């Protein structure tokens, strides 16, 4: 997260300023939002379009052999 | 004379064997059949409930 103090002081300082804001963590930026929504689609494909907030359920059966 | 002696000897033990072999089998094997299938039936269902508890949680 942190190394070279001579740059680092300013650089890290600007990063925290981000966190210290709630119009986004200082801003967000369209570009990210566009990709987010895309990437969000894809991984739903990755593991099917059910919603794993709920779990599966099954049904039951039998037949006579002879 | 000696022919007839053996002819009934054959036929008699023949029907002894085949009938007694029929008798012994039927009990066990039919007892067999009932329990085998029940087996099969029941098994399936064990799995089917279970698997699912996996599938779902996954």
Curated annotation (Swiss-Prot), chain A:
Subcellular location: Mitochondrion; Mitochondrion inner membrane
An MF annotation (GO) of this entry: proton transmembrane transporter activity
Keywords on record: Acetylation, CF(0), Hydrogen ion transport, Ion transport, Membrane, Mitochondrion, Mitochondrion inner membrane, Phosphoprotein, Transit peptide, Transport
Key word Plastid present: no
GO CC annotation terms, alphabetical: mitochondrial inner membrane; mitochondrion; proton-transporting ATP synthase complex
Sites bearing N6-acetyllysine, chain numbering: 6, 11, 44, 49, 64
Summary of the function given for this chain in its UniProt record: Subunit F6, of the mitochondrial membrane ATP synthase complex (F(1)F(0) ATP synthase or Complex V) that produces ATP from ADP in the presence of a proton gradient across the membrane which is generated by electron transport complexes of the respiratory chain. ATP synthase complex consist of a soluble F(1) head domain - the catalytic core - and a membrane F(1) domain - the membrane proton channel. These two domains are linked by a central stalk rotating inside the F(1) region and a stationary peripheral stalk.
Family: Belongs to the eukaryotic ATPase subunit F6 family.
Protein name: ATP synthase peripheral stalk subunit F6, mitochondrial
Gene designation per UniProt: ATP5PF
Whole sequence portion shown: 36 to 101 of 108
From Swiss-Prot, chain B:
Intrachain S-S bonds: none
UniProt-annotated location(s): Mitochondrion; Mitochondrion inner membrane
Positions bearing N6-acetyllysine: 6, 21, 29
Similarity-based family: Belongs to the eukaryotic ATPase B chain family.
Subunit structure: Component of the ATP synthase complex composed at least of ATP5F1A/subunit alpha, ATP5F1B/subunit beta, ATP5MC1/subunit c (homooctomer), MT-ATP6/subunit a, MT-ATP8/subunit 8, ATP5ME/subunit e, ATP5MF/subunit f, ATP5MG/subunit g, ATP5MK/subunit k, ATP5MJ/subunit j, ATP5F1C/subunit gamma, ATP5F1D/subunit delta, ATP5F1E/subunit epsilon, ATP5PF/subunit F6, ATP5PB/subunit b, ATP5PD/subunit d, ATP5PO/subunit OSCP.
Task performed by this protein: Subunit b, of the mitochondrial membrane ATP synthase complex (F(1)F(0) ATP synthase or Complex V) that produces ATP from ADP in the presence of a proton gradient across the membrane which is generated by electron transport complexes of the respiratory chain. ATP synthase complex consist of a soluble F(1) head domain - the catalytic core - and a membrane F(1) domain - the membrane proton channel. These two domains are linked by a central stalk rotating inside the F(1) region and a stationary peripheral stalk.
Name of protein: ATP synthase peripheral stalk subunit b, mitochondrial
Organism: Bos taurus (Bovine)
